[model samples]
Target chain A: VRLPFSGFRLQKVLRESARDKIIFLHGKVEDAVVILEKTPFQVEQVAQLLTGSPELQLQFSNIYSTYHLFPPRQLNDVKTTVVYPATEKHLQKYLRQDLRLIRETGDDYRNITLPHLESQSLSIQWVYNILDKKAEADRIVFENPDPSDGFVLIPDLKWNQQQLDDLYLIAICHRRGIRSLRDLTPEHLPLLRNILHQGQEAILQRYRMKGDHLRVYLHYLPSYYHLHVHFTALGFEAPGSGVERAHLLAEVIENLECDPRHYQQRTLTFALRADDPLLKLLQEAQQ
Target chain B: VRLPFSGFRLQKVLRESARDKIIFLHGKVNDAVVILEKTPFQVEQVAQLLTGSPELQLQFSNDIYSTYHLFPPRQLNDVKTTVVYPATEKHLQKYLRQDLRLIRETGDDYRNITLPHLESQSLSIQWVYNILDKKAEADRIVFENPDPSDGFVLIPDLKWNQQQLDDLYLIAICHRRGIRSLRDLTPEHLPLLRNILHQGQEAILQRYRMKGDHLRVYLHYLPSYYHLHVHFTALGFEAPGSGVERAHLLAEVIENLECDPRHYQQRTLTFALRADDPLLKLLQEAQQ
Candidate 1:
């Protein structure tokens, strides 16, 4: 039977492991852990090795959090270290390597693809299952629940603090069925406004930072579908803040004031990696 | 006295005027007309001679539509040849020489300049005017002279889809005479600019059958052309350069420029650079 690594031992084992070596063994999650406790291997090398073996990859994807492939070295017990699912880049790389995903072209998407909820058998719920409470202990950065306002603020699981003075947090709306900005309307203004105001305060208190240090925005075709807002330091050149994708929350609020259905009425464009499943769906629909 | 070359004769005169050679002369608008009627010089040579002489640039900007400089010898009496101001890159060259306009950048523009500049060949003012002059041959005109009251023309952007993103359109407007970019838009230009916005919005809505709330209206700071233009898109659509960093709401821009004519000039703007952009290197050097 596999059990979560017990306490400080996991950290001690990882520390003594060789910095960069690959080890592959056919066994359970605890087997990997036991191997880590005994043998030394580079986490990423093992991950790449698994990609070539479907039996291993399927088992790995099903049984283990991808975070095991690159576990953090930060062992500070006082400070929190959030571990979430693989980033979009990692996911894209996996998708390209794994035969499970599909790819599409611009032409295929426009002509062939219908909305997935209407046609595709597989759905986003499966993706959402991966981000649930089961992993909250490992990923919660600063969780202050306000059921009244309908949201929670947590540091993104993937932020490494490599840029913009290391500030990156996401405000996740708690209301069910909210997916993208297109779903927001005047009705949610107060909820959104409350989140913005309180979320900033939470960040200020938790990070002991000034309010002026943050720049908040939302991404269209956000990495995941569940409605969330990103707050990063203005000085940091986060990937999605480019003119093509980032929409300022302040502007969005003003836009909502002018027209409740502002986002719903406008045609939106978002990039889909060639290997993304949605891209294939669009192409399949086109066919 | 030349009372403006009229009708088909004017088109013939311009077409036969120059194959290509430079001619400089001391001439009024009529003098240039007379010269076109009498002798032929490269269309650019006439435009160049008029540069720096505001009286001449204004007269040239007003009297000699850059169109006259490169108008083909076409007798389209059955079809009206509508004249409109600009279509960006294809028309910028035509605007520069024919219009006396000022271009400004932030004093710190060097620190964050993101757009690439052409290094191989410096475009001449006359050459730009020629591009404007020869626009017809290129079939690049979209809408022409909506009305004398409205100071703009509306065109479907080359990048838009009529159905996919039903609200994509471009509005090209110049002052009745001699205005370029937001810096030159004065309070007097308010009604004209306002009219363009309303009409362009209404026109897009009517054609697409989209509701008012569905449209997004804005402008680009470093417009592809010096002549002011407006961009309209479906509200949910994220068009290129539509983020807060580059896109300014048209209404907000008008209010700002009205409140402070140099509002755009005073602010430090941020824009993206290509991964291999030389400007990125410059920005890095600025930090050092």
Candidate 2:
């Protein structure tokens, strides 16, 4: 199995001679299967088209399917780990060791809770501290902290190119207090749009990839509490990508705008492995 | 390569066949991974343990994991219809015609099935009589009292098979009355619900040769059929409609009705649907 390229962004790594050795797995944006097409999609292009540079309505197409856009691989060619009762051991190890430092809690919001932007207490501040220095220390593939509309992209450690030669990344919003998809409002449309727009641009520029090369989704009860979105290479059957867990951010934003509390009443259910502490906590809470 | 035994109880099938050919897939009643030592267990031994006969919990201990169990085979080994794309013309025809029905709400299903009780909150006694008369369409009554006064009948759900260890036994309790859904149940129906719950539990324990703990009794939110029915499944297994989202415990349901007759009417309920399900459109409409 190929070791995942978790050290630095592909843009940095591709600058070197070893670039050709790595497969260019992303697909073209033009060929994406869009269900709802938006006009004048280019941010600069829209500005250029306007008289006196008048602000235009942000428009972007909703993607329905993208299977045709990516390179085809045989099912047998895909890499997958056999998950079962024993697989919990590896999962527990990852949860306890790698996740201990990064995982945030409701308490983290006490002092640094958004809009307030408390420097010492905010969990996202920790992330910014590590990535802002242009330090190649963390798994940040791309960083764009534009204050109003910015997000940092990083590879999900557990899914760092393990299954189906899968490339899984997280696009974490820098905006504080925006916890999960449920917290998203129409006010954050530009940020959401930028994440999709700029996030894909980074992947495209870095890996010579396109929109069709990726599958974007947001887990309701994301493995961690803090808000983050997922981007996986096409054909990778990552856990929690099922219909019940994975909701397209595009749809989520639409639903959120229609009803601010769209996710509040909705009882989202996801399978928990028998040994998962969250499951035990939920059972205990119910009792 | 063997065909899934879709009909009859797996216990009966295993009884006739060479015992070695059948695999023991039952998990423990407690931890849900109990492996068998050998042979078969009669229902009587389990009954005696409760009567202070002995400490016979019928406990055993684990099996090797198989990828086959994790991912159910889409294409049968013996029946070679193309499961993958770029299929042959013949395979394409089968895929387009046969497999497509499995994806969405079949028009034939709505056409063939009568909705006599749709407008009325409950089915008419005459309609229930018609269902009983037309036994082919309705499930065969596994156990029933000829007397209409009995108020309940046990029938094998079209979904469940006779697999004891496979944990997919679905015994449906069809209330003789016109009651439909949990919302319809009142204090008056409590005795009837209790009768069916106890009888259904007894019937399952006797047939599968297991104790009360091994089985689970529950109900669906928007049942496939509107008529009231209790679902009986083996514990710890992921039987269809057994999850917390869909399955409401029969005991909890009775208690809820006892506390408040309109409990189910007021409380919101959630259910799952396939990507192609028509209900998805209804949900979207509700969102709109």
Worst 10 residues of 1 chain A by lDDT: A75-84
C-alpha lDDT of residue B279 in model 2: 47
Which ten-residue region of model 2 chain A has the weakest summed lDDT? Answer: A31-40
Off by over 4 Å in 2: A1-287, B1-117, B120-140, B145-150, B158-167, B236-239, B243-245, B272-288
Question: All models: lDDT?
Answer: 0.43, 0.42
Give per-residue CA lDDT, model 1, range A191-240, as digits (tens).
78866777888887777655445667888656656678888755444556
| Candidate 1 residue runs with Cα over 4 Å from true position | A1-114, A117-133, A138-144, A161-164, A274-287, B1-244, B247-288
Report how far off residue A207 is in candidate 2 (Å): 21
> In candidate 2, what are the lDDT values of residues B104-177, reduced to their tens digit?
12223222221222443453446555655555446466655343434566666666656445555665555465
B26-79 per-residue lDDT for model 1 (tens digits): 112212221111111222322232222211011011110110111111111011
**lDDT over C-alpha atoms for residue A74 of model 1:** 22
List, residue by residue over A1-287, the lDDT tens digit for candidate 2.
11111111111110111111111111121111000000101222212222122211212212211111111111101111221222322224222111100112233223222223322222243345433543323456797877667788876543323222345777877775666665666677788877777887887776666564466678855544456778765433344454435666655665556556545433343444444454444444344
lDDT of 1 at A82: 13
